[PDB]
Design brief:
The structure is cut from a larger assembly and holds chains A (89 residues), B (62 residues), C (51 residues), D (239 residues) and E (78 residues). Chain D has 239 residues and is mostly beta strands. Chain D is built from two helices and ten strands; from the N terminus they run H-E-E-E-E-E-E-E-E-E-E-H. The longest helix of chain D is centred in the last third of the chain and has 10 residues. The radius of gyration of chain D is 22 Å and the shape is elongated. The chains are: A alpha+beta (89), B alpha+beta (62), C mainly alpha (51), D mainly beta (239), E alpha+beta (78). Chain D binds three RNA strands through helix 1, strand 1 and helix 2. It is classed as ribosome. The entry lists the keywords archaea, archaeal, ribosomal, 70S, kink-turn, protein synthesis, RNA, ribosome.
Chain lengths: 89, 62, 51, 239, 78
RNA sequence: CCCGAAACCGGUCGAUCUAGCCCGGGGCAGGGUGAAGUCCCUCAACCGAGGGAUGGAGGCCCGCUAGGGGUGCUGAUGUG
RNA sequence: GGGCCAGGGUUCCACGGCAAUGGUCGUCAGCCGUGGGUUAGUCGGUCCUAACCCCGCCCGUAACUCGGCGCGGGGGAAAGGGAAACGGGUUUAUAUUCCCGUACCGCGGGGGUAGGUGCGGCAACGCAAGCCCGGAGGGUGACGCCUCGGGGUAGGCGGACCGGCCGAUGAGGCCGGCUAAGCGUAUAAGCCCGGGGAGUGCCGUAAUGGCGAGAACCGGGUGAAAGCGCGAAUGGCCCCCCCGUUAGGGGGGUUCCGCCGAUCCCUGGGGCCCGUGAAAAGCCCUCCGGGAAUUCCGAUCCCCCGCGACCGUACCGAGAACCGACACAGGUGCCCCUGGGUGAGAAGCCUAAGGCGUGUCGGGGGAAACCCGGCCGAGGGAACUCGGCAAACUGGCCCCGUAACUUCGGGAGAAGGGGUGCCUGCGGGUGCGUAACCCGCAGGUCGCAGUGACUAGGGGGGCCCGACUGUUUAAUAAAAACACAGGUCCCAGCUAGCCCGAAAGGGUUUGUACUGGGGCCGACGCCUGCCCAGUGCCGGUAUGUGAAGCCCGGGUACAACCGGGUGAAGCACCGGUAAACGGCGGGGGUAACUAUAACCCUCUUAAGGUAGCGAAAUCCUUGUCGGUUAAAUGCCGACCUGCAUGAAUGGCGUAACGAGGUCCCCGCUGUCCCCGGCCGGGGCCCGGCGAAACCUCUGCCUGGCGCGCAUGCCAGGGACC
RNA sequence: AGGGGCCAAGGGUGGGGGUGUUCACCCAUUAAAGGGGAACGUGAGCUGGGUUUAGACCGUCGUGAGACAGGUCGGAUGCUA
């Protein structure tokens, strides 16, 4: 296409027309692994997808059911222990 | 730079100078945003000078 | 791409193109020898421009 | 006569001699609008980063009034250490309190010179100031140069030492690796000598290797002629 | 005899590469976490050290986790 | 009488050449050598000794890869 | 050759031509004439913001069309970030856009139902999302370097089948056999979760290595690419048999099986570091919830109605559309870097798809001399020349073997010696079962030669310089110069020092003595003597001295004016200071003997050349001696009295390194003795095409003369164009 | 076999080693290995090492810039009669 250089948004799959023309297509970059951030671990039940694709996809992928889907269940495993200690005293 | 002038000259290719919104001469340098001839972008005023330049065309016009 | 003209620049290019005609023969009759040569004739290659 | 010199260019703030300020990291602020007295203030080390232009490691700190600011990192800090600011801060390492509140004979850094201006003193890798004597009038602190400056007792400072020591213990290795460091900082280089610079370029030294006039220069000497050993009291290593 | 000094080749001269071989060798050594105490700490970066086990990251010397200057601070007391 | 140059000065106009500085991108066949780091065997109480593996560093080598430079031929040209 | 960015700007495309233009003709064309063509919800612009910029305001300036800060706003990438689409068909020219098919963005409705504003599963977890204006917060957007391994498939090739073709014999070879974006349903190494419970402590990866903050080992969950189906019997390839001036067509059949080998692309580990490696628009979630809720509500679930503000799209993109005045052998970005054979190869050669024969003047002379490219030369082996310059030789690869020196890293691919083809038959490795490759072994055998071509280091030693790599006079000097790492001296407590600015103000500085500013020297190894007299710098200064001001005296009806004290920095003056600039000497006399003088006198001017090194990157001079050459104004080693060495205006020495200077040796060789022949392009002729430099004139030669270095004067001679 | 002198240019009068070298020094040969002139013959012929450009170093000199017929490496050779 109009991008020639193999830039980042540019990257390529070979595409065939049946015409046998064989033309280059750009591909969207492949997904970086969202983190817990409260302790650095890639998150189970958290998708990978392209940052555009997440707009037109489903939200189920985008979280787990437990509170703070952003952090890992074990890190939450800290946080509740703290919250109660906090209500108790 | 000195000789080997042929070997050198692949720029000019890029343009930095045009038909001006204000005057119409060939000097509205796209990069500065300044017209060399008229002074548009730089000044509210037209460029005119004792030497002149601008004046000379105008007298010549008369 | 294209490049990549601005709309106006195309208007200007179009004008220069217009200037790059050859007069018509009838004017010429009307004149009865005459202003000729049409003086502007601009060649794509030969000449530049303005832009 | 000759052109402006290598130093005179520097002063213009022209871009070969302009520090990057967009790859560089925060400055120290302690903030005195929540004052020292009537303290309210603890924070948590949010992360630790390297600051390029300080050539030292620096800490991001998340305060508990809701402001985020950098404080120059002490040695032996953990991420999730609590740093306190005030006088009623514990007397331990990385904690920040006034000089009066700090014991005598303890190592200290990041000392204020005007109360509440955020640290303008001892903010380099591995070096530290010593509190030699304290009197309610004035507290005298001994600086990295061996030299004693009197400061107000109501200056802030942090207990401990700076991190990033051994810094000049390791060498720079090669001209390549060095080139790499100077881009990270700002320091006009490769820097040649005036001695084989032409008479136009530089005040001393001609075509070939030998000095013009003496290297040693006045303290009333002109701009653009104040190069060499500047106002040297002595030179050499002998009687 | 050579350290990590083999990278240098013929070059840099004895003292620098000897220094380099020694300083890198000790830099390579397993270091005791200030946080835990197991021998987990490795160098991420210049002056930045991190313990694999506990995950603690802290500032230290460029080559070593602790410098002799840093060591002095502990000794004066809280 | 007329012409004739190197200047000097004043106000302006250039970093599409080029120099360095910065942002954000991209390019560079193939091959070699082989460091640290790590491992094992056999032989010795230890000290070590012999062998082999694994790993893979370099302002590194070879290289008419692309690309950059331009030493000699004082060659070819030298109103190209 | 294919697709494109900039840039060009109609050069594109058709018809009609050739006066001009095209390095020649021209019926051709990029020329001339005349008409025509670039169509976008889903490509990009436009949006964001970077480095950075401007504007108002504040302020400066005599002032501005000038100037830097601080506020506030706005702008900044047609290769950053970023919403969504492909295929086929059609046109003279355009097309992801027009058409056909299939797919889909944004916003705005509508109709249903989950939803008493979600139900259901111990749990690791299930989708038909989560009422709502508002603002808040939080992840992801989001970024340096290089290996290795894991996956994807573009795609190269053998076998088999189906047609087309070529074809001694009817074999073998060539060829067509395709599947899109969009969906639906599946991804799975990373990464969590239960069970279990680390016995000489076990286990793994290609590897480093994990573990009692959960092992070995079993079940789960969980997030890139990938497969199938839809898309799609179509469409698109490929044939066959009929209709014919023509047009418009018709009916058919094939359109396939594996297994095997790869760039890139995407995903984990890991190594690195005195570069620790922008933002935001947007999503996704969460906190609060202004209000509306049971006649209810809401639409992330379905399905369905409507719409798309604006600019761009041609062609070229190049050894003729760019730029160099020229259609210039120049030189400017990407992408195709994995076509086949070759072979380590994006190498060469040959060759495929594809392109061209307009790198645009032809023909003739077997073409003689001469000139450029290039081929070959006996014998001899640098005798040439400043100089082996040029050129030659070696040559790939495998094996053997490998010195001096050394910073132990290297030197080193030292050096030198051997081998290498085809065939026939085996073995090993990896795997799965005989694939795809790779590594060896034996026998037979041909040539002059087996890297036979192309590709493809000549080697060795001493010395000088500079550590190296890099850089340098873009364009007569690439070096010994420069940088350089390392070393040292110096200055400054940040309200600094230094530096810029007319000013306001500013750089360093998101900087704070492990800083950052300025010089000197220039890697390592060993060292760095001695002098503060002179110059310079620095600190200080009773005393003398030292301006204007003020004071006092005098003068003047006032004033000018005259005199003295008071007199700061500055000077005189004192000390320090040479890894500051710099200096670092002369005569005589003397020792068993002839030599010299270890020895002893003398004086300038601060000190008196020390460690070293030395006839030098030392005059005389080709010193002298020795090596080396038959023979060497050389080189090298030595002595050394150095015309006119010497320690950070660095001394000495130095491994490694060099398109550096000089010398020697071996091989080799047309450099030479001494030149020949050949080949191709010119030369030379013809045809067409067609300039320049420069221009008082011209058939002389020799002597004399003369501005003393004459074709022209003078005297002879030669003399047809 | 010489020394010294006359006639005589018809012919001959070399090759190498050092040097940028005309000169000169040496070697081995040779009959002999003569001298001088021709824009110190010969650059619209070559060569371009040296002299006397612009780079650089050392010594001396000079406060310094900077200099040197001192030493030294490198430094283009146009034209269609």
């Amino acid at each position: 296409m109009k991008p020639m250089y193999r830039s980042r948004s540019w990257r390529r799959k070979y595409v065939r027309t049946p015409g046998g023309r064989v033309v280059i297509h750009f591909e969207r970059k492949k997904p970086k692994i969202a983190h817990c951030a409260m302790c650095g671990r890639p998150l189970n039940g958290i998708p990978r997808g392209r940052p555009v694709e997440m707009r037109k996809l489903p939200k189920t992928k985008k979280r787990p059911e437990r509170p703070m889907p952003h952090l890992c269940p074990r890190c939450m495993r800290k946080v509740m222990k703290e919250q109660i200690r906090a209500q108790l005293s | 730079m000195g000789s080997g002038t042929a070997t050198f000259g692949k720029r000019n290719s890029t343009p930095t100078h045009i038909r001006c919104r204000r005057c119409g001469r060939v000097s509205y340098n796209v990069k500065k945003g300044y017209c060399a001839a008229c002074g548009f972008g730089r000044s509210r005023r037209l460029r005119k000078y004792r030497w002149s330049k601008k004046w000379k065309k105008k007298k010549n016009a008369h | 791409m294209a490049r990549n003209k601005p709309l106006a620049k195309k208007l200007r290019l179009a004008k220069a193109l217009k200037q790059n005609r050859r007069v018509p023969v009838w004017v010429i009759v009307k004149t009865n020898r005459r202003v000729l040569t049409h003086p502007k004739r601009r060649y794509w290659r030969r000449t530049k421009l303005k832009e | 006569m000759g052109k402006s010199l290598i130093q005179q260019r520097r002063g213009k703030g022209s871009p070969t001699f302009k520090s990057p300020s967009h790859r560089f990291r925060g400055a120290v602020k302690y903030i005195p609008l929540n004052y020292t007295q009537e303290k309210t203030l603890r924070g948590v080390v949010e992360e630790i980063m390297h600051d390029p232009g300080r050539t030292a490691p620096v800490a991001r700190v998340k305060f508990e009034n809701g402001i985020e600011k950098l404080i120059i990192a002490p040695e032996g800090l953990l991420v999730g250490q609590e740093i306190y600011i005030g006088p009623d801060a514990p007397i331990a390492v990385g904690n920040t309190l006034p000089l009066a509140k700090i014991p005598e004979g303890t190592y200290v850094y990041n000392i204020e010179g005007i109360p509440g201006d955020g640290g303008k003193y001892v903010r380099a890798g591995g070096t530290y100031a010593l509190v030699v004597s304290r009197e309610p009038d004035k507290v005298i602190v001994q600086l990295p140069s061996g030299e004693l400056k009197a400061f107000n007792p109501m200056c802030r400072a942090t207990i401990g030492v700076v991190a990033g020591g051994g810094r000049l213990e390791k060498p720079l290795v090669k001209a390549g690796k060095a080139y790499y460091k100077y881009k990270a900082r700002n320091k006009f280089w490769p820097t040649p000598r005036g001695v084989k610079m032409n008479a136009v370029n530089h005040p001393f030294g001609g075509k070939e290797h030998h000095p013009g006039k003496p290297t040693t220069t006045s303290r009333r000497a002109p701009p653009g002629r104040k190069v060499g050993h500047i106002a040297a009291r002595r030179t050499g290593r002998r009687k | 005899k050579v350290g990590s000094a083999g990278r240098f080749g013929a070059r840099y001269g004895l003292k620098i590469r000897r220094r380099v071989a020694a300083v890198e060798a000790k830099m390579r050594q397993k270091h005791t976490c200030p946080v835990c105490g197991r021998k987990a700490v490795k160098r991420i970066s210049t002056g930045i050290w991190q313990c694999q086990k506990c995950g603690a990251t802290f500032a230290g010397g460029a080559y070593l986790p602790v410098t002799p200057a840093g060591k002095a601070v502990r000794r004066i007391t809280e």
